[PDB]
């Protein structure tokens, strides 16, 4: 009922994007536990983000079931890098990822609005759009502090941020 | 130390296979919560399996870090089906998946043995090989009961199994 | 005192028979946990019976010591089958076993009576004869329900009995 | 999977040997509660060993089921003696029994290694090989103390050992 | 009802025998607290036996009342010795006493059986015959340990038995 | 049983090496509590490592006893330095020590494998090989952070590491 | 301040002697857990002594740091024997060791007195001299009881001492 085929397909694309985001954060988490990086609170922070993205994907999969759509899964692409370079660079990449996921969600909302699907609009507003705003804000805060502190080249910056903000 | 490049690569392949298994089980979980399947304990059972496979993948990623190897992630391929057909068919597919993952782990163990890597052999024996045996046994039990009960065509079989064994 | 050599020997034969019964039930327990049988409550039920028969044997061994007799152990023969065929067939075999053990106990009681051994008669009446009656009754109940339900050929019967009576 | 027929048969032989060990210890337990031996802590010690051997047998029976093998039970032979002669002699016989069971387990491990069965090797290493080493050590300790104390001919030795080490 | 005069008289004889046994054990208890014996746990052990025999006598007196018989008390004869010689000798005398009391109870049971008095037979089987078997076994155990330890001439034997088995 | 003389000797050499490692860490602990070093959490960290190495030595001494080998102790050589120079240098020396101890353990495992001693192989895999991997990883993490922070010449680096990672 | 170079060197010699004493007691502890000695409370007693000597060494190392001295470690020599012969012989060797350590401490006190170092004198009096007196007294008590009991040749003596004084 009131579930447009374009919306079903767009939900499936968003599911894949959320799973991709989860994979990016998983990669980041295990980069920070390398013996040549060893920033354990950066690691835990990104692991927590990874698990949150899996929950984001699952809520959309539940939505598809609830609305009578058909979940169509696609390959989860590997992240763009295996070496994330530094705490600052990972934070900057996460910030860009969240902005890109946000743009996809806003396009999905525009599609739902065009199709007159208020249930889908409310779902996105309730569980996704403000979560994205908060995440983009948090990551921007972290990027700003790391830059001001002199990361990645100032030897104390990422260590101090790991042990005081993320710990 | 004592970490052969062939082993590093084989660990990365096993990481990908564990993530694939997690994805298969996630797909199965959300198949069973469709409005035309609606077997909620099959759904929860496979969701729990999915989360266990993610843990399997993470332990190998930790092993790579601990040994000084480099994690190299690859695309997580989508599962072979989106429509898993029945509770019995999903159980049979899970059984085959676990046997295939087991064969990969036994090949990894043979490689570790050939390279004289007792730490890697013990890691596989401690966390993987018996887990696989138990999982293959459990799934075989479930397949047998579903077949004997008359699944998928006997209308009460999958429902009764959902509500008594998996619930 | 008042302990006839025929009674000493008959007690030793009964010890062996109780140990045999324990072995039969152990075999049954592990038949029901095969991956092609997988009736876990049948398995637990027969395992509990096995442990009870070991206790039956030990009480007779204690009796021999208390009365000044000499325990003389013999081989414990393997059970008649390794494949118990079905839940119904195992229950029917257990019923026959308990009737046979009961007949042996009643012959032992008749011998004790003939030898004027009231301590031995009371021992059998107190710990064995009513236990056997209760066990034969319980197994007869189980056989009747399984037969009426359509076991072994009705696919739901043994499963439902496992999950509702024995569970 | 990866379960060699020679291994299936060797597991069945080991099951029988563990059940035999349990029977030997049961015989010993009830020897020590004779009115002409009356060493109640020797009795309890060997009864506890008997129950441990039954658990050893059951774990192998479970392994057979888990791996898809077929349990094939054989007669449990009676112990070599019904009169165990003394506390020292029983301890010496138990020590020899455990060494013989250990040799059988090491042959089983060598077979599993030859067949490339790391799951079976790990199973034996995890639950059997160190248990055997500890048991052989404990029994050797007990034999040494009993010999030094003058057992069986020094009238106080077995009594004092019963009441201070085993009690 | 169904209470034969021969049984009434035999119950009265058994009452007297139980009271005699209580007196023997009282004498033994106070022998072991002499300043030239001073085995306080032998003393407590026999005092406990004395009190148990008084209970045995009282239960028969209650039986007489319950059945409508007439209690006819007789002198309680003094024990055969006032000097019980040693811990071993007292244990051996207690063993003989319990065997003699057992023979009297078995004769009483035979009389009750001949008179068709199942209530009296059951009373003896329930409260007397197995108690006697257990007591004869316990005393035989104690005699055996004391003999093997070298009592009464080995200076440490009775002391060690007092402080470890009876204490 | 199955305990090769070469293995007995190699175990004794490993005992000595573990005791040496304990001594190195004890020296390091008391270097960091000098009035001209005064890094109390470096001190506590290395003291904890010292106590862990003593436990490593004791477990091998117990193994020798359990297997019937003869412990043969040798002088514990003093550490290579009394002045450990800096927090970074001590961490780098500890890392090299643990790699050297690891290589000795892997040689011991290879010897045990060659001699067909699965109990010894499992002992090393269970209690030593993964402990070494974890320790080498931890020390590598610490070295990396100290280097990146600018230790030993950056005046705040070792102090901050002491007070945030090791405290 | 007021810390003479002769005192610094003598403290370093005493550190080494305390570590040697700890090693002697460690050797003794593991002698008593051999399968041909098996005196578990002798073993625990000497293990506790070993740990106490390590604490004695550490307190002197702390003293060196507190006073601004330089700890200079030396090899810890192996104990004089690996086979300690008997419980009595080990106790006699421990008694001689403690007397020798006491003489070294009294020489250290005489040196501190000659150098006008009341802090060092008080340190020795507070933590070492009375501890040594108590230890020499305790070991003398143990030697006396073992000798009087007939150790090592009286088969019950060391066993009884293990189970009553040290247990
Ligand atoms: Cl908000
Ligand atoms: Cl921030
Ligand atoms: Cl900086
Ligand atoms: Cl298991
Ligand atoms: Cl099942
Ligand atoms: Cl149906
Ligand atoms: Cl009833
Ligand atoms: Cl029923
Ligand atoms: Cl049916
Ligand atoms: Cl152990
Ligand atoms: Cl012992
Ligand atoms: Cl003796
Ligand atoms: Cl009883
Ligand atoms: Cl006794
Ligand atoms: Cl004596
Ligand atoms: Cl780990
Ligand atoms: Cl770190
Ligand atoms: Cl700085
Ligand atoms: Cl004092
Ligand atoms: Cl003492
Ligand atoms: Cl002696
Ligand atoms: Fe998201
Ligand atoms: Fe996000
Ligand atoms: Fe897995
Ligand atoms: Fe799996
Ligand atoms: Fe029975
Ligand atoms: Fe039965
Ligand atoms: Fe066993
Ligand atoms: Fe055993
Ligand atoms: Fe009585
Ligand atoms: Fe009595
Ligand atoms: Fe170590
Ligand atoms: Fe280490
Ligand atoms: Fe000391
Ligand atoms: Fe000392
Ligand atoms: Mg960190
Ligand atoms: Mg690609
Ligand atoms: Mg709106
Ligand atoms: Mg809203
Ligand atoms: Mg977020
Ligand atoms: Mg349902
Ligand atoms: Mg594809
Ligand atoms: Mg292992
Ligand atoms: Mg699993
Ligand atoms: Mg079931
Ligand atoms: Mg046969
Ligand atoms: Mg029964
Ligand atoms: Mg006893
Ligand atoms: Mg035979
Ligand atoms: Mg054992
Ligand atoms: Mg006394
Ligand atoms: Mg008279
Ligand atoms: Mg009694
Ligand atoms: Mg500090
Ligand atoms: Mg040197
Ligand atoms: Mg191995
Ligand atoms: Mg470590
Ligand atoms: Mg002992
Ligand atoms: Mg030397
Ligand atoms: Mg002391």
Residue numbers in the entry:
A (entry chain A), B (entry chain A), C (entry chain A), D (entry chain A), E (entry chain A), F (entry chain A), ...: 10 to 176
What's the paper's own text on this?
Ferritins play a crucial role in iron homeostasis and detoxification in organisms from all kingdoms of life. They are composed of 24 α-helical subunits arranged around an interior cavity where an iron-containing mineral core can be reversibly stored. The ferroxidase center (FoC), an intrasubunit di-iron site, catalyzes the oxidation of two Fe2+ ions coupled to the two-electron reduction of either molecular oxygen or peroxide. Mitochondrial ferritins are atypical of those found in higher eukaryotes in that they are homopolymers in which all subunits contain both a ferroxidase center and a presumed but undefined core nucleation site.
